[PDB]
Ligand binder design. Structure first.
Ligand SMILES: *[B]([O])([O])[C][N]C(=O)/C(=N\OC([C])([C])C([O])=O)C1=[C]SC([N])=N1
Ligand SMILES: [K+]
Ligand SMILES: [K+]
Ligand SMILES: [K+]
Ligand SMILES: [K+]
Length: 263
């Protein structure tokens, strides 16, 4: 609704930085509303959903097992590893690592998972091969969050990300049981509460993944809808703001309040 765009563009004004926004119909793929939808933004941790998509694609292909155990150690740990730092002695399974990566945004979990598929370059190849000729991962944690102005490394566009998320969650790309496991990880959350979830009515479904990086970068990808069933995808990104985390969070939550009101 154009009234939601009143709020999106106000966010860009208030944050002093670009905002990108997409609302898509999940079933049809229709673009319901957008703003800077084909401009690049840093993915930040929103890539972790894509990553676990690529992992699940390998599982489906008999190239990976969700129960396979990976052993790691102190030196592997990178900044912000709230789950993996607890499991050095006895390791974690691939499903446990995707759970940690998506539900907690654990950064070491993401690196461990990235290693399984061949690194960033292979995530990019996976994306290209599913018809996303835009999104690219180039680096590992921590550097992929650096959000350098004009850098295309580690970026997506709102439109590409929304399209790709629709494919992963609902297309023949993954088997049913696996696309369900991807959305189930996304339904769990300990870190995106201040974002769309804070605006979500009782009884509604959401499956999401947030991101935060350098230079004010912040974002979220989500599938949401009423009565326990998702029916739209929303993607919001911003980069370049000098605002506080709370200020960026609130702008995203206010975009969410608006898109709910005008649903
Ligand atoms: B992902 O974008 O969710 C991973 N995020 C990070 O590594 C960053 N922040 O994460 C915490 C520590 C949870 C936070 O307080 O937002 C991060 C990377 S670079 C930067 N300035 N913040
Ligand atoms: K429109
Ligand atoms: K170990
Ligand atoms: K221990
Ligand atoms: K989530």
């Amino acid at each position: 609704h154009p009234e939601t765009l009143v709020k999106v563009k106000d966010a860009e004004d208030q944050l002093g930085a670009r905002v990108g926004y997409i609302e898509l119909d999940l079933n049809s793929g229709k673009i319901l509303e957008s703003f800077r939808p084909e401009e690049r933004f840093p993915m930040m941790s929103t890539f972790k959903v894509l990553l676990c998509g690529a992992v699940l694609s390998r599982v489906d292909a008999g190239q990976e097992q969700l129960g396979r155990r990976i052993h790691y150690s102190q030196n592997d740990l990178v900044e912000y590893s709230p789950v993996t730092e607890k499991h050095l002695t006895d390791g974690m399974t691939v499903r446990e690592l995707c759970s940690a990566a998506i539900t907690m945004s654990d950064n070491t979990a993401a690196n461990l998972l990235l290693t399984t598929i061949g690194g960033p370059k292979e995530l990019t190849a996976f994306l290209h091969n599913m018809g996303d000729h835009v999104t690219r991962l180039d680096r590992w944690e921590p550097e992929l969050n650096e959000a350098i102005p004009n850098d295309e490394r580690d970026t997506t566009t709102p439109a590409a990300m929304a399209t790709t998320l629709r494919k992963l969650l609902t297309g023949e790309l993954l088997t049913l049981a696996s696309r369900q496991q991807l959305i189930d990880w996304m339904e769990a959350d300990k870190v995106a509460g201040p974002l769309l979830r804070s605006a979500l009515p009782a009884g509604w479904f959401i499956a999401d993944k947030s991101g935060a990086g350098e230079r004010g970068s912040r974002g979220i990808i989500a599938a949401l809808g009423p009565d326990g069933k998702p029916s739209r995808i929303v993607v919001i990104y911003t980069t370049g703001s000098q605002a506080t985390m709370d200020e960026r969070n609130r702008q995203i939550a206010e975009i969410g309040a608006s898109l709910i009101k005008h649903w």
